[PDB]
Design a protein around this ligand. Structure first.
Ligand SMILES: *Cc1cc2c(cc1C)nc1c(=O)[nH]c(=O)nc-1n2C[C@H](O)[C@H](O)[C@H](O)COP(=O)(O)OP(=O)(O)OC[C@H]1O[C@@H](n2cnc3c(N)ncnc32)[C@H](O)[C@@H]1O
Ligand SMILES: *Cc1cc2c(cc1C)nc1c(=O)[nH]c(=O)nc-1n2C[C@H](O)[C@H](O)[C@H](O)COP(=O)(O)OP(=O)(O)OC[C@H]1O[C@@H](n2cnc3c(N)ncnc32)[C@H](O)[C@@H]1O
Ligand SMILES: C/C=C/c1ccc(O)c(OC)c1
Ligand SMILES: C/C=C/c1ccc(O)c(OC)c1
Lengths: 550, 550
């Protein structure tokens, strides 16, 4: 196809068609589309940001390309170094709240790694891990398990939805909610195509499997892995693995993730917390439970509006256009038998042990006035505890999608600072956020999710994507909240295309020593900057900062 | 001082003198010794390899230098860049059986980081962490916790001995024996002097502590960290920390290590395994128990000669020159009250739960006939268990040095493959190791240390460092094992100065794509090639491969 709306920097129309006619010859026309529509979560777009805060077409691909397999990725990489052509690798492109499939640089080719690169490559019961291609969704992998009666043996650990890419999520360093919720920390042995085109495997993945007749003549891509490949991440040497999470250093083609054995008993729970103010003592209490492992998973602390928004949109509680007052929030709490904060978690293992831990956790929380404890059976059909009772055991679900529709054209954008596991710090941070949402006309919505020693605080910004005045207010909200949080010792863990540069500029200790170091490595491996220029605000040297930053 | 024993490559004598005059001028003449002696473990040699498998003076320093503070590191680096003078950064130098403090490239300035950079910088109780400089040992920190009453609230994690660097050990990805035994994974927020001289902190170390009056005009090195610095490793962006473990990518000046809160309950134990081949069902029993937090820490499976060696030299069990037969080990077993294999563990937490786990564990090893269960109290006062009763509760000893004296002028060399947590694989690794050991005329000595999904097989080669015939036999044994294990799908996790090249040549999947990518990164951040040339087989372009490899 001949004429995209946007060409990549320094590229000509003739060169673009050669590239595209070229690419078609490899992957066949059915896997190539030139752009000359927001889509849904169940069928994501691949051209731009579906939950746009900037114009609908601010981050826009010149085309999408689905490689059939690894060779194609190498084949594509080579043409991009030929023509000097931004690539933007995705697995599924469900990164809503963070850009979705959109490419940081417009005119980039969107590499839809998920469409054909699809296979649950392994599920090893004794080693209690799996191996996975870009397109294996949580749900997918969930299904794979049931078709082979393995659900009786190995559990998944899932994010708040079913559709993300197991490995896509994992290199974004995302988070689920069983003991295996640190997703990045559960990988071992990844395969990568480099900016140069050469195929790499990490850690023990570098120790090749010994030779035998059955595997002779196999192109690298298709070779099996040695025994320890997905068991021990470290390998030998400089441990480069992290170089591929939240960076633009390779295109990940496969990853191994550790899976949890059926623990032999499971029980989830909802402790409700009556006052807004109860955040402080609640978090304080959490600290030792977490740190001494009364708290087994990533439990979460939910603001009333999140749960509520899962239950019905805003027009369903008040035809107010402005934020909900501190009093209506009490009404809605009491309406749904919920607290002003709500604590969700679970218990793993045999009856005898669950009991002791749950009693400890029951005891500790009883210090908070008005606390109430609920198992899943104690709640209405539609409850969040019921939904989460499946999440904390690795069942994929989609009920939590609705909180997006809090507003007539709901789109979410995540502002994601980290917080000490201390009440004082949590209150200070929340206060900063709440003040600011308020100035912007927005309901404050958020979870804190509980790290061992930190807390991911996900301010869930929902806005109406057809409202210009609001979008702008969202853009003023985010930018403001970044600076505020930095002026108080708080960086964010993960962001959106439009915020990557500012956020990085927040991590500027010693005159931006971290970024500089990062640029050096980036130019070294990517001589012609063709891989995802601009991710995490890391720019190859041919991308002028003045021209390309926000 | 004027005329050294070995000069670094390509450097004139004149140059060495203007160089070391400059370093004497910066650090004072008492922080510079020029070489023109083996010592022991407690006054560790800084010049060479105390457990030499090669000639004593093979791996040798030209000078040792002891920087007083961070800025001397910056000046020594600027100068080494100026002169093209390789540096060997050490922390304490107790890396015995991996080279000790010897430089890989003879002629280097050994950089004694630990002599003066020494402070326990912080101990944070609610965050449950510490920051540490290179010169803090395991003992050092332990005395810091005792003289501040902190043993009550926080526990350490120690290897077999107490002299090792907390930070040194950690960047080696070394292993200890509580739930916090994966030393490197417990790190967060590290300081590094880059090869070009610039100071860098990683993770949320890159988030600057917000300006306040008391910290104004402080040299960057002396500055506080922001609050999440040492609670969440990831920060934002590509996750670069692992580029500074088992790499030559920089000199580490500060590291945060997580500390485990007092659990509220403790108890070690020993399970004795009568037959040599009982290793097989043991590992098989440990598998599901490790993966399921009945086994919370890192327990060890010890060979009978490992404990025998702690209680008396070889000359005291046999007057034989050849290795011990099967029967004479059964003899030394029934003697000491031990098995052929011995499993050392510990339960952590409040009694109710300890109780239950321990019944599961006892009950699981009972499928092995002749099994026997001991608490520390049930054993001889000089027992290994009473030594490990301390190691698995954060208390250092020095008792385990005794096994190095299994032969006359004792020296150890570690062969450290990784195995599956399966008895089949473990037997197979054992039988492959046992075969070659006999050929070399050496007794087999070892432990498997039980990672979650992996086992570190530490083959404890002891040899007479004053026996030319046998040291050669050991070199042969080493080089053959590496190869044998590789042909069997096993790689080593860490090794000695003389075997770095071979082991890395072992990880040659897809024509050494791992090394090549590593080399690219090295030449990028270290143009002149001065930080630790040759570490892990990663050579800068100025070091010919033909000239330097082994
Ligand atoms: C809308 C929303 C989002 C959400 C959530 C709840 C709602 C209602 N709850 C989340 C939570 O539980 N935990 C979490 O980590 N994220 C949560 N989100 C956000 C989002 O839905 C999920 O994280 C989702 O998993 C992310 O989408 P996906 O997994 O599909 O990832 P992607 O869209 O394909 O791409 C993310 C980035 O990853 C990098 N990437 C992906 N593939 C490659 C390859 N192989 N090579 C190099 N880089 C790759 C890209 O940078 C990409 O943009
Ligand atoms: C003989 C012995 C050794 C031993 C052991 C039992 C016996 C009887 N059991 C161990 C175990 O339980 N677990 C373990 O990790 N090690 C065990 N050892 C081996 C060794 O003695 C110890 O691990 C020891 O703690 C290591 O020595 P040390 O801590 O003093 O480290 P180092 O000599 O200073 O240097 C180690 C390597 O790391 C790099 N390094 C060190 N500092 C820096 C800085 N600051 N910057 C960059 N790199 C650094 C160097 O490359 C050096 O080679
Ligand atoms: C709602 C929960 C949530 C949303 C986005 C994220 O990135 C996340 O992980 C920390 C959690
Ligand atoms: C004997 C113990 C030992 C020695 C050297 C090592 O590297 C190690 O790592 C787990 C353990």
């Amino acid at each position: 196809e001949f004429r995209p709306l946007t060409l990549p920097p320094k590229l000509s129309l003739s060169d673009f068609n050669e590239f595209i006619q070229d690419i078609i010859r490899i992957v066949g026309s059915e896997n190539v589309e030139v752009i000359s529509v927001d889509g849904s979560y169940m069928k994501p777009t691949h051209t731009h940001d579906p939950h746009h805060v900037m114009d609908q077409d601010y981050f826009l691909a010149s085309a999408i390309v689905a490689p059939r397999n690894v060779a194609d990725v190498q084949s594509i990489v080579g043409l991009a170094n030929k023509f000097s052509f931004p690539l933007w690798p995705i697995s599924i492109g469900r990164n809503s709240g963070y850009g979705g499939a959109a490419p940081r640089v417009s005119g980039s080719v969107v590499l839809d790694m998920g469409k054909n690169m699809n296979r649950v490559l392994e599920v090893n019961v004794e080693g209690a891990y799996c191996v996975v291609e870009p397109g294996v969704t949580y749900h997918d992998l969930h299904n794979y398990l049931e078709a082979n009666n393995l659900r009786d043996k190995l559990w998944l650990d899932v994010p708040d939805l079913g559709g993300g890419s197991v490995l896509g999520n994992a290199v974004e360093r995302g988070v689920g909610y069983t003991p295996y919720g640190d997703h990045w920390m559960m990988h071992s042995g990844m395969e990568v195509v480099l900016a140069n085109g050469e195929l790499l495997r990490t850690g023990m993945g570098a120790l090749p499997d010994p030779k035998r007749p059955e595997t002779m003549g196999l192109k690298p891509e298709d070779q099996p892995w040695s025994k320890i490949a997905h068991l021990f991440p470290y390998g030998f040497g400089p441990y480069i693995d992290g170089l591929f999470s939240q960076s633009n250093m390779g295109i990940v083609t496969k990853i191994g993730i550790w899976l949890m054995p059926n623990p032999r008993g499971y029980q989830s729970y909802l402790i409700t917390l009556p006052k807004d103010g109860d955040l402080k003592q609640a978090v304080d209490i959490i600290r030792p439970l977490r740190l001494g492992m009364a708290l087994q998973n990533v439990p979460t602390i939910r603001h009333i509006l999140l749960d509520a928004a899962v239950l019905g949109d805003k027009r369903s509680y008040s035809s107010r256009t402005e934020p909900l007052s501190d009093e209506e929030l009490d009404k809605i709490a009491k309406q749904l038998n919920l607290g002003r904060w709500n604590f969700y978690g679970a218990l793993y293992g045999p009856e005898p042990i669950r009991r002791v831990l749950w009693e400890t956790i029951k005891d500790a929380f009883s210090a908070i006035p008005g606390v109430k404890f609920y198992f899943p059976e104690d709640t209405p059909e539609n409850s969040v505890l019921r939904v989460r009772d499946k999440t904390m055991q690795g069942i994929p679900t989609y009920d939590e999608l609705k909180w997006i529709d809090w507003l007539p054209n709901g789109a979410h954008l995540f502002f994601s600072p980290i917080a000490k596991v201390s009440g004082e710090d949590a209150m200070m941070q929340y206060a900063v956020t709440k003040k600011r949402c308020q100035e912007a006309g927005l309901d404050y919505i958020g979870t804190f999710t509980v790290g061992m020693r930190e807390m991911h605080h996900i301010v869930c910004i929902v806005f109406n994507k057809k409202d210009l005045i609001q979008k702008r207010k969202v853009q003023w909200l985010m930018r403001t909240l970044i600076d505020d949080c930095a002026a108080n010792g708080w960086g964010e863990y993960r962001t959106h295309l439009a915020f990557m540069d500012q956020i990085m500029e927040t991590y500027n200790w010693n005159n931006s020593s971290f970024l500089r170091f990062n640029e050096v490595l980036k130019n070294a491996v990517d001589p012609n900057g063709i891989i995802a220029p601009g991710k995490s605000g890391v720019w190859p040297s041919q991308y002028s900062h003045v021209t390309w930053k926000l």
